[PDB]
Amino acid sequence: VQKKNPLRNKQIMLRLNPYASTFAKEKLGEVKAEEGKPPKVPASFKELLHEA
Amino acid sequence: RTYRVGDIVDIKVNGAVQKGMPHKFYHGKTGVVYNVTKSAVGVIVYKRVKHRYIEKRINVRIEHVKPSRSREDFLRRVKENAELKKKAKAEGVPVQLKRQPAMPREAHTVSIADNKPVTLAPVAYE
Amino acid sequence: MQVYDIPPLLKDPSQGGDATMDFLVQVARKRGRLGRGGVPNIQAAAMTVVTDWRDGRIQGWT
Amino acid sequence: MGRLQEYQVIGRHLPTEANPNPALYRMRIFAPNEVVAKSRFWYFLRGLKKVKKATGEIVSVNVISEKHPLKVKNFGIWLRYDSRSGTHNMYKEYRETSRVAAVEAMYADMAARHRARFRSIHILKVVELEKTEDVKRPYIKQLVAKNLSFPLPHRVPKISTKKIFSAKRPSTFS
Amino acid sequence: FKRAEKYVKEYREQEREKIRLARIAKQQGSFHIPAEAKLVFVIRIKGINK
Amino acid sequence: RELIYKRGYGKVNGQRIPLTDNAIIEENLGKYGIICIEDLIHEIFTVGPNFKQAANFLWPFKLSNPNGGFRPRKFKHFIEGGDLGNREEHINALIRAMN
RNA sequence: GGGACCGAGGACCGCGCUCUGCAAGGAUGCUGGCGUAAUGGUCACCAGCGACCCGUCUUGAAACACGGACCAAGGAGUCAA
RNA sequence: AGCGAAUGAACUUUAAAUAUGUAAGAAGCCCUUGUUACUUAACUGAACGUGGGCAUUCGAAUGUAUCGACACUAGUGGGCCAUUUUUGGUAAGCAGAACUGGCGAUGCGGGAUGAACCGAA
Numbered sequence: 001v002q003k004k005n006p007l008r009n010k011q012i013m014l015r016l017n018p019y020a021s022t023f024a025k026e027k028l029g030e031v032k033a034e035e036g037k038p039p040k041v042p043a044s045f046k047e048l049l050h051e052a
Numbered sequence: 053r054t055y056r057v058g059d060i061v062d063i064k065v066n067g068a069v070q071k072g073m074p075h076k077f078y079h080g081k082t083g084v085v086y087n088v089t090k091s092a093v094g095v096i097v098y099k100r101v102k103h104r105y106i107e108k109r110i111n112v113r114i115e116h117v118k119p120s121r122s123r124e125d126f127l128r129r130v131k132e133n134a135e136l137k138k139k140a141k142a143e144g145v146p147v148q149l150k151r152q153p154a155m156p157r158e159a160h161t162v163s164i165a166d167n168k169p170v171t172l173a174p175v176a177y178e
Numbered sequence: 179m180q181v182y183d184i185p186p187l188l189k190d191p192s193q194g195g196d197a198t199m200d201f202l203v204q205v206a207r208k209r210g211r212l213g214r215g216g217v218p219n220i221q222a223a224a225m226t227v228v229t230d231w232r233d234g235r236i237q238g239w240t
Numbered sequence: 241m242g243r244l245q246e247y248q249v250i251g252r253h254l255p256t257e258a259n260p261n262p263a264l265y266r267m268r269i270f271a272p273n274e275v276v277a278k279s280r281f282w283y284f285l286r287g288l289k290k291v292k293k294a295t296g297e298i299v300s301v302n303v304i305s306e307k308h309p310l311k312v313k314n315f316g317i318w319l320r321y322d323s324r325s326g327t328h329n330m331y332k333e334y335r336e337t338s339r340v341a342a343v344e345a346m347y348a349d350m351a352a353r354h355r356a357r358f359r360s361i362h363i364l365k366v367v368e369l370e371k372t373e374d375v376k377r378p379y380i381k382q383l384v385a386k387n388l389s390f391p392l393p394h395r396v397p398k399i400s401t402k403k404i405f406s407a408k409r410p411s412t413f414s
Numbered sequence: 415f416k417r418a419e420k421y422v423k424e425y426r427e428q429e430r431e432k433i434r435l436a437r438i439a440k441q442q443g444s445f446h447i448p449a450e451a452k453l454v455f456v457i458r459i460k461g462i463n464k
Numbered sequence: 465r466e467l468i469y470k471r472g473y474g475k476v477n478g479q480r481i482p483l484t485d486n487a488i489i490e491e492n493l494g495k496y497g498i499i500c501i502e503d504l505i506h507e508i509f510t511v512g513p514n515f516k517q518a519a520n521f522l523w524p525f526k527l528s529n530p531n532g533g534f535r536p537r538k539f540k541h542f543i544e545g546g547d548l549g550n551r552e553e554h555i556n557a558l559i560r561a562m563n
Numbered sequence: 564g565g566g567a568c569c570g571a572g573g574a575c576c577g578c579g580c581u582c583u584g585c586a587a588g589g590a591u592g593c594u595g596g597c598g599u600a601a602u603g604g605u606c607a608c609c610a611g612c613g614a615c616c617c618g619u620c621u622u623g624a625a626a627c628a629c630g631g632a633c634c635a636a637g638g639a640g641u642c643a644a
Numbered sequence: 645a646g647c648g649a650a651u652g653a654a655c656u657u658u659a660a661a662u663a664u665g666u667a668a669g670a671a672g673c674c675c676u677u678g679u680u681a682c683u684u685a686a687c688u689g690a691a692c693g694u695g696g697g698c699a700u701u702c703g704a705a706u707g708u709a710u711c712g713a714c715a716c717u718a719g720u721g722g723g724c725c726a727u728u729u730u731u732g733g734u735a736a737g738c739a740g741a742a743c744u745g746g747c748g749a750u751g752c753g754g755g756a757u758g759a760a761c762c763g764a765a
Contacts, residue, residue, distance in 0.1 A: 001571085001572065001588055001589050002571080002572095002588090002589050003482045003484060004484070004587090004588095004589095005469070005470055006469045006470075007466065007469055007470055009586080009587090010580090010581090010586080011579065011580065011581095011585085011586065011587045012484070012578095012579090012587080013469075014579065014580060014581095014587090015485075015486075015578055015579045015580085015587075016469075016485075016486060016500070016501045016578095016579095017418055017500070017501060017502055018415045018418070018579090019415050019418035019419055019422070019502075021580090021581090022415075022419075023422065028422055028426075031426065034430075039441060041440075042440075042441060042443065044164075044443060045440060045443075048164075048168075048169070048248075048266075049248055049302060049304055050304065050307075051171055051266070052171050052268055060666070060667080062665085062666080063665095077742090080664080080665065081664095081665055081666090082665045082666040082667095083665085083666085084666095097665085098665085098666090120666070120667085121667095122665095122666045122667040122668090123666085123667055123668090124667090125667070125668075126667060126668055126669080126672095129668080129669090129703075130669070130672070130673070130674095130703085133669095133703055134673080134674070134698095137698075137703090138674095144225075144229070145226075145229065146211070146222050146226070148701085148703095149701080149702090149703050150701065150702095150703055150704065151668095151703085151704050152704070152705090153704065153705060155452075156449065156450035156451065156452055157297070157449065157450050158449050159435070159446070159447060159448050159449040160447055161435075161439045161442075161444045161445065161446050161447065162252075162264075162299055162444055162445050162447060163442075163443065163444045164264075164443050164444060164445065165443060166261075167261055167263075167264050168264075169250050169264045169265060169266035170263070170264070170265055170266065171265075171266045171267065171268070172265050172266070172267055172284070172285070172288060173364055173365075174284050174287075174362045174363065174364060175287070175320065175362055175364065176288055177364075179420075185416075185417045185420060185421075185497075185503070186416040186417055186420075188499060200497070203495070203496070203497045204497055207496075207497050207512065207513055207514065210513045210701095211700085211701075212496075212513055212514065212700090212701060213700055213701060213702095214700085214701060214702070215517070215701095216496055216513075216514055216516065216517040216701090217495055217496075217700065217701090218495070218496065218497070218700085219700055219701075220700085221700070222700080250445065273554070274552055275542060275543060275550070275551055275552050275554070276543050279543045289645090290645055290659090290660095292660090297447065298447070299445045299447055300445040300447075417499075417500065417502060417503060418500075418502045421502055421505075421506050424510075452511045453508065453509065453511055455467075455555055455559065457527065457555075457558065457559075457562070459534075459538070459547060459548070460539065460548070460763095461763070461764050461765075462764095462765090463745090463746085463763085463764070463765080464745055464746070478709065484578085484588090485577090485578060486578085487577095487578075516705090516706085520706095520707085539763095
């Protein structure tokens with residue numbers, strides 16, 4: 001009878017996508033990056049970046 | 053050169069012979085032979101007016117006509133697919149028998165060793 | 179799921195009666211076997227899976 | 241030409257059987273965004289070599305940020321521009337903070353004095369002048385004078401444009 | 415529910431894989447060239463006069 | 465995602481039917497393996513073998529005019545300060561305004 | 564969080580969910596004044612903005628040219644072979 | 645572009661820009677064999693077919709708000725302007741050809757104004 005937007009209506013989004021509840025509860029839009037010591041930029045890369 | 057009624061010919065219009073030469077619109081054309089005479093060949097060509105195509109009949113001599121190979125790609129494919137299909141059924145795996153358009157290139161890495169990049173100015177001074 | 183992806187099968191009434199109809203569709207998706215209108219080649223996808231099983235592409239034991 | 245950024249664009253001709261591991265050329269391009277920097281790369285490479293977008297690919301595009309965007313520098317820009325007569329040479333100096341800001345200052349300057357367009361200006365060299373004696377133009381020379389200090393005569397105050405009527409007349413001293 | 419579970423995981427893994435490959439090329443000295451895009455959205459913005 | 469969820473309509477017997485149910489996706493693209501919205505979104509984004517059937521099933525998207533306008537003059541190419549042509553990821557800024 | 568415009572259908576059925584029912588196949592609940600020119604409508608006039616005088620003929624088109632003082636009644640593709 | 649390939653627009657390994665002709669399978673086939681007054685030294689070839697299969701991507705993409713044939717009926721059968729390509733000439737004008745677009749049957753926004761401009765039906 002009328003088209004209801006799933007971006008604005010939470011009930012329509014759960015009708016079309018039942019994982020939208022688990023997406024919000026587990027905060028899958030806010031996943032942190034994996035751990036690890038980030039290794040430095042190699043010196044050859046910086047010299048080419050500032051070559052001229 | 054021997055021509056048969058019904059084959060596909062290409063009109064080139066050589067400038068050595070001024071007899072039997074068609075118009076410049078019919079130069080560099082391609083049509084189907086409907087009539088063969090002693091020295092001239094009648095070729096049916098297509099010409100577009102606004103949206104449709106009006107078929108026109110022109111008499112072109114032997115010195116301006118040559119065979120084409122546009123069909124030859126189609127018959128080359130019809131045997132190549134035939135042998136491939138028989139060879140596929142012989143050992144029993146499917147093969148993509150179609151030709152597909154060129155796809156975007158996949159990801160790859162390029163090493164910088166031995167190929168250090170050269171910097172270039174907008175205009176060359178040397 | 180780790181080999182040919184296969185997003186999970188709709189089970190339908192009963193178990194295995196219609197699930198492996200959907201499995202042949204999903205395998206033909208990942209292989210790329212369709213129709214003129216796009217209808218997947220379920221039978222060629224099935225003979226692909228059997229051939230891959232004969233070659234040892236899928237692990238399994240009793 | 242907007243808030244320009246320096247880009248390091250590296251591109252090469254497509255690898256073939258006759259010539260695998262191709263030449264790998266590199267340019268520095270001042271462009272408003274990523275997409276313009278690729279286009280200026282292939283435009284400049286087309287004039288120099290026979291490498292176009294159809295037979296070439298982009299290897300890397302990186303942004304060259306300033307080392308010290310808080311230190312005042314004297315820059316020298318050597319450029320060619322095209323007029324109705326032909327192609328000419330200039331060397332102009334700009335007292336700025338970043339290499340991109342000197343290029344923005346150059347484009348507005350060439351549009352103002354000489355009515356030059358972005359399509360006619362070729363930037364050949366942007367050089368930071370390390371020493372004070374390297375400055376050659378008198379408008380930069382008076383800026384690098386020892387104990388430089390000046391007043392600001394006739395300063396019109398910032399009055400809001402919706403304040404149509406004022407009660408007392410403004411002053412232009414402070 | 416399980417189809418949408420594996421789609422979200424795949425999108426995250428595909429995004430991280432492009433970053434990791436670009437990182438491991440930069441530290442090995444090389445350049446990683448990402449794949450040319452397979453999808454394009456075309457919007458018509460001009461009238462059909464002339 | 466926003467285009468399919470908000471402006472997504474289907475060709476069902478030559479008619480423009482909004483995608484308000486997962487059922488009408490299954491009646492039309494269920495033989496291709498597509499049974500819900502997320503499979504339709506997965507197929508367009510990760511370009512699969514059934515892209516031709518899924519893209520043709522979608523009615524062409526009737527976007528509105530962008531919020532904030534195009535540019536001062538929009539009939540030049542994007543690489544000379546216009547709007548026509550190819551833009552890498554700036555089409556996402558255009559799609560956000562037209563949605 | 565702050566606004567604007569709209570309430571389309573008329574027992575139930577469907578797709579779903581935050582569950583003694585819900586925001587889920589289109590607005591209900593509570594309250595006030597008036598119950599008559601109050602809303603609404605029709606003319607006359609002022610105000611803001613818009614707006615060549617009709618028909619015929621020619622031509623790619625205009626322009627020229629022709630008819631037009633006003634009203635009532637009559638007035639032009641019919642019949643036969 | 646090269647002539648650290650040969651040779652010398654009329655040179656080429658390669659190859660633009662810009663439009664353009666033709667072909668892309670079920671009507672094609674392939675395998676077995678029937679006719680012919682065509683053809684061949686000849687159960688040799690050419691045409692039409694019978695029997696099996698390629699019917700699930702059946703042999704590029706994209707679209708498809710259907711397409712073809714026969715019979716019948718009405719209005720039409722003038723051009724103007726512009727882009728691009730091309731031919732000829734003049735002191736300068738200008739004259740011809742091909743494609744395409746606009747106007748003729750088209751209202752609306754803009755260019756103060758409006759047959760030929762921009763935007764958009």
